[PDB]
DNA sequence: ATTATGACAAATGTCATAG
DNA sequence: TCTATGACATTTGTCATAA
């Protein structure tokens, strides 16, 4: 799936058959494709998604994310921390507060990634103003937002911290 | 490319050829997909990351920033609009002037992006006292300003527009 | 426990066309 | 506009070789 996830399993120094085993593709594949004769992009979505998620399960451990944010004020400084990026959207919220990013970001994440009109909830600054049919969202059958959502949810967010520098530690 | 993701692509209501207009990919592989004649497990790397970067741009969350300025008197009131801060600071200009803001706030930004010293670089209220300095950063690019930069400059300001507002909207 | 190269049936991407 | 169906050169996945 992510192609930087797979491109690193190329970087890696781990045998091509212990790829193949692991993963289920073939070690003629892993091969060719190090070596040059074949390229990520020509490859099917089942054998890549294969190579991926192995790569992201071995990363899950090693993988420490540290967020820095910077008001207008050089003093105020907003810094969290988690393996995941969902841990590091509850590390800030209880360390600093729902009100420190925009109003409202989360919900208004979600519902743009399950295709709501926004125009519906009425979104202004002061966040959702429909609260009613947010609520009927809520009990709705919905898509539960991914790690990548959580981050963009940082950087989405201008109103209070303008500046957004992730840092990944790989181990 | 997440299978999800680019199922809700061709789980949509938008039509096959458009899909394929906007994305690159044949309409008639989409519509193969969308009967079932052909599988997304089996399409290549670079075609399904086509369709998920369209769909990621659809569920993407829009931004837009309403500026809002005001005198030490207050009787004086300036107002800008823009999606990025680069913007609102284009409009502020072509609306206003570039005097209006602080003397080569522009420049002042640039220089501590360098991280030239503001004290050996002739900082004044007047504007670029050192005219040589100045083509001395012209030979070097450096680091061109982000748009957060552009935030920091009308925050920066004091002189003329003392009172700085930003409003964010994600409608 | 490794690493390159096939062969082969089956798909793909890029173009069309037809309705 | 839009869908469906295919042509063609070419890469795939699987399953092996050989070293």
């Given at each position: 799936?992510?192609?930087?996830?797979?491109?690193?399993?190329?970087?890696?120094?781990?045998?091509?058959?212990?790829?193949?085993?692991?993963?289920?593709?073939?070690?003629?594949?892993?091969?060719?494709?190090?070596?040059?004769?074949?390229?990520?992009?020509?490859l099917?979505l089942?054998?890549?998604?294969?190579?991926?998620?192995?790569?992201?399960?071995?990363?899950?451990?090693?993988?420490?994310?540290?967020?820095?944010?910077?008001?207008?004020?050089?003093?105020?400084?907003?810094?969290?921390?988690?393996?995941?990026?969902?841990?590091?959207?509850?590390?800030?919220?209880?360390?600093?507060?729902?009100?420190?990013?925009?109003?409202?970001?989360?919900?208004?994440?979600?519902?743009?990634?399950?295709?709501?009109?926004?125009?519906?909830?009425?979104?202004?600054?002061?966040?959702?103003?429909?609260y009613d049919?947010?609520?009927?969202?809520?009990?709705?059958?919905?898509?539960?937002?991914?790690?990548?959502?959580?981050?963009?949810?940082?950087?989405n967010?201008?109103?209070?911290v303008?500046?957004?520098?992730?840092?990944?530690?790989?181990?």
């Open positions: 799936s992510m192609r930087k996830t797979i491109e690193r399993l190329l970087n890696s120094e781990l045998s091509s058959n212990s790829i193949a085993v692991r993963t289920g593709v073939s070690q003629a594949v892993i091969s060719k494709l190090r070596n040059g004769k074949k390229e990520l992009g020509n099917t089942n054998s890549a998604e294969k190579l991926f998620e192995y790569q992201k399960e071995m990363e899950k451990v090693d993988t420490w994310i540290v967020y820095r944010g910077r008001t207008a004020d050089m003093n105020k400084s907003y810094i969290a921390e988690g393996s995941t990026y969902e841990e590091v959207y509850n590390n800030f919220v209880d360390k600093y507060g729902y009100d420190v990013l925009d109003e409202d970001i989360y919900e208004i994440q979600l519902l743009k990634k399950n295709g709501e009109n926004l125009d519906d909830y009425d979104v202004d600054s002061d966040g959702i103003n429909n049919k947010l609520d009927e969202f809520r009990e709705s059958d919905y898509v539960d937002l991914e790690d990548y959502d959580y981050r963009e949810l940082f950087e967010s201008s109103s209070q303008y500046y957004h520098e992730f840092e990944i530690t790989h181990e």
